[PDB]
């Protein structure tokens, strides 16, 4: 059988982890003995910094990075890092499924990267070893971020110190107190046990963590059309599965964290939320020329 490799950086019991495993199941059911899919979770094969290079080198055939991690290939996907751009996951999905959103799947083709679909995780929440109620509380704290200039600007706007690090290192950096805080979805905070060493989480919903499932032109073109159709259908169905898992994990993992008693969740008043928005919104003007103001206008419009 022709081997297909799918590599990602998350734990198995997560929306992306389950997506990849479902994709394996469906492909192997439909094309038995023709294609086998080997899934490599937890950065076992490639991690944040080298996965896209590996993809284009055809050392791996599918990856699904955070939309934050594509700056080397397009400046447009930085849109998804803008603070308080999307109110909630309904707006995210409306944007992603619109013409404007769908066009972004093709934003990197001229560089060899084929966009196959969006996959959800969830809204991001701040955590630290001290309460984060107003933006002033972030002053002087070190936060790990995904490798994104927008996210660096986000934390610089509140006089915090952002450090770009691969996802596989975050637990250890929190454990050793090399950083004070981070931002992530409930699913990652829970599945990677960040909550065990973060006494405070704020339900800030201040950005989105979603993915684009991608492959290389090299691999995609190499498939016979009829097999590609089956593989694409299998991928799409796996994505829908992953999205259902993503939605479920928001509530389930938030609850599990609260039940553990290891972390105290803070909820923001409208005026507290407004203070974060006002502190961080200026980041957008920094990036708007490269992202595209019209693209930003489309994203804002998805909130209606
Ligand atoms: Cl994870
Ligand atoms: Cl990693
Ligand atoms: Cl999609």
- Show the domain range for 98: 1-304
Pairing of strands 264-267, 62-63: unpaired
| Burial of 247 per CB tally in 10 Å (0-12, 13-18, 19+) | middle
Q: What does the block give as tokens for 196?
A: 């065990």
- How many domains would you assign to the chain? 1
Give yes or no for a contact between 190 and 256, defined as CB atoms under 8 angstroms apart: yes
Kindly give the distance from the C-alpha atom of residue 273 to the centroid of ligand 1, in angstroms, as a whole number: 27
**Who's near 69: CB < 8 A, 6+ residues apart?**
48, 52, 146, 147, 148
**Is 281 labelled as part of a ligand binding site?**
no
Ligand nearest to the CA of 8: 2
Main-chain phi, psi angles of 229, to 5 degrees:
-60, -45
**CA pair distance 20, 239, nearest whole angstrom:** 8
Calculated CA dihedral for residues 224, 52, 95, 303, nearest 10 degrees: 160
For residue 120, the domain's CATH number is 3.40.190.170
Count of C-beta atoms within a 10 Å radius of residue 53: 12
Ligand nearest to the CA of 188: 1
Kindly give the distance from the C-alpha atom of residue 29 to the centroid of ligand 3, in angstroms, as a whole number: 23
**Who's near 181: CB < 8 A, 6+ residues apart?**
126, 127, 128, 129, 132, 138, 141, 142, 143, 144, 160, 198
Ligand nearest to the CA of 117: 3
Q: Smallest Cα–Cα separation from 132: which of 45, 200, 208?
A: 200
**Is 16 labelled as part of a ligand binding site?**
yes
Kindly give the distance from the C-alpha atom of residue 150 to the centroid of ligand 2, in angstroms, as a whole number: 19
């Amino acid at each position: 059988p022709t081997e297909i490799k799918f590599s990602h950086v998350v734990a198995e019991n997560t929306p992306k982890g389950q997506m990849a495993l479902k994709f394996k199941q469906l492909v192997e059911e439909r094309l038995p003995g023709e294609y086998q899919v080997n899934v490599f979770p937890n950065s076992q094969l490639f991690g944040d910094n080298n996965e896209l290079s590996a993809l284009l080198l055809n050392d791996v055939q599918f990856v699904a990075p955070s939309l934050s991690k594509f700056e080397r290939y397009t400046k447009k996907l930085q849109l998804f890092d803008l603070p308080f751009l999307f109110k909630d996951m309904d707006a995210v999905n409306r944007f992603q499924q619109s013409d404007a959103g769908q066009q972004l799947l093709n934003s990197m083709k001229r560089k060899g990267v084929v966009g196959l679909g969006y996959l959800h995780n969830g809204m991001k929440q701040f955590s630290a070893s001290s309460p984060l109620v107003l933006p002033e509380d972030a002053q002087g704290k070190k936060f790990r971020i995904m490798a994104s200039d927008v996210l660096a600007a986000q934390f610089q706007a509140v006089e915090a110190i952002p450090v770009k690090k691969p996802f596989s290192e975050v637990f250890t950096l929190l454990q050793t107190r090399a950083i004070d805080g981070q931002e992530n979805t409930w699913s990652n905070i829970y599945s990677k046990k960040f909550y065990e060493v973060q006494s405070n989480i704020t339900e800030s919903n201040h950005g989105v963590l979603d993915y684009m499932v991608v492959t290389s032109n090299t691999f995609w073109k190499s498939l016979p059309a009829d097999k590609r159709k089956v593989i694409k259908a299998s991928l799409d169905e796996a994505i829908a599965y992953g999205n259902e898992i993503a939605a479920a994990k928001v509530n389930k993992d938030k609850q599990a964290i609260i039940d553990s008693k290891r972390s105290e969740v803070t909820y923001l008043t409208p005026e507290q939320r407004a203070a974060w928005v006002n502190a961080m919104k200026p980041v957008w003007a920094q990036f708007e020329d490269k992202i595209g103001k019209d693209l930003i206008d489309a994203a804002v419009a998805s909130n209606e």
